Nucleic acid binder design. Structure first.
Ligand SMILES: Nc1ncnc2c1ncn2[C@@H]1O[C@H](COP(=O)(O)OP(=O)(O)NP(=O)(O)O)[C@@H](O)[C@H]1O
Ligand SMILES: [Zn+2]
Length: 250
RNA sequence: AAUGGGUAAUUAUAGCGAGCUAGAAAGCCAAAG
């Protein structure tokens, strides 16, 4: 999805910066919104990274059914507007107080129990109804999104035929430089079930109406009382100057 | 003494054996959007 960019693409690297940043907010938000379908918060998440995020949850039935139902919810969201290019696969290993110095073959042997369930669910993706609804036919499409070859919701953003996600990514590339990224319900790129992402300035938080706010690269607590993400980014200049600034002063 | 004749050595020696500048640019594309 990220290196779907090719030769003769409208976006140079803003369509690549804003695309590898967007999936990282999606990986952040799956981790966040999974923890309030449960009763938990950010402490229980051991790590979040490039789509991978390890947790510590409770070995009980009301959590496992919440895991399965939220997994089906987010995969319905990914099928609604990414069409089997993105698939999130949960997986959970039950363990006692065995991550404590049967000392060698107890810790990693249950950390790998979740990776086996992921590899089993990554390999047998869907079920009956959600694949019969896939290849149901019924579409007289003439055109397609020339970035990702999708069909639904075609617009003419800068006289090229692009889709709903790949116009939201240009809008997010105009909004990428901000520190604050809020989740609304109907604005910008969708990142979940009834949950969309929008980049916002600081003093526009009273104008906008959100539910959860992320602040990027900040250790001060701030005013919005946000969730602190940390994405590495830097821009000294635009890309086309990087050859011309390759000279010395002489 | 005349008379017959020439015979030996060197066949090039000492050097420099290339130096410096340029080492791909400008367009299409990409950017500008
Ligand atoms: N948002 C992102 N932007 C840029 N690079 C990323 C991002 N997320 C992950 N990556 C990179 O992608 C790597 C993982 O690639 P990938 O093969 O997709 O792993 P995966 O999540 O297991 N997908 P798959 O290989 O199909 O199972 C990471 O190690 C990162 O280097
Ligand atoms: Zn697209």
């Amino acid at each position: 999805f990220i290196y779907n960019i090719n030769i003769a693409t409208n976006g140079a690297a803003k369509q690549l910066k804003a695309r590898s940043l967007y999936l990282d907010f999606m990986s952040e938000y799956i981790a966040d919104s999974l923890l309030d379908k449960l009763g938990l918060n950010r402490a229980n998440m051991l790590y979040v990274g490039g789509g991978h995020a390890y947790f510590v949850l409770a070995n009980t039935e009301k959590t496992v059914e919440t895991l399965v139902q939220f997994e089906k919810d987010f995969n319905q969201f990914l099928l609604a507007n990414f069409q089997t290019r993105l698939y999130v696969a949960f997986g959970w290993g039950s363990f006692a107080a065995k991550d404590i110095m049967n000392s060698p073959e107890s810790y990693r042997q249950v950390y790998q129990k979740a990776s086996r369930m992921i590899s089993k669910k990554k390999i047998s993706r869907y079920d009956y109804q959600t694949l019969m609804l896939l290849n149901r036919g019924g579409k007289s499409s003439e055109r397609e999104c020339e970035i990702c070859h999708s069909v639904e919701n075609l617009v003419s953003y800068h006289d090229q035929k692009v889709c709903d996600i790949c116009r939201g990514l240009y809008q997010f590339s105009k909004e990428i430089a901000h520190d604050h990224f809020i989740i609304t319900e109907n604005e910008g790129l969708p990142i979940g079930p009834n949950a969309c992402l929008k980049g916002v300035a600081f003093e526009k938080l009273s104008q906008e109406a959100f539910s959860r706010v992320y602040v990027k690269n900040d250790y001060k607590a701030g005013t919005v009382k946000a969730t602190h993400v940390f994405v590495g980014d830097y821009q000294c200049d635009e890309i086309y100057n990087y050859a011309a600034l390759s000279k010395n002063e002489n």
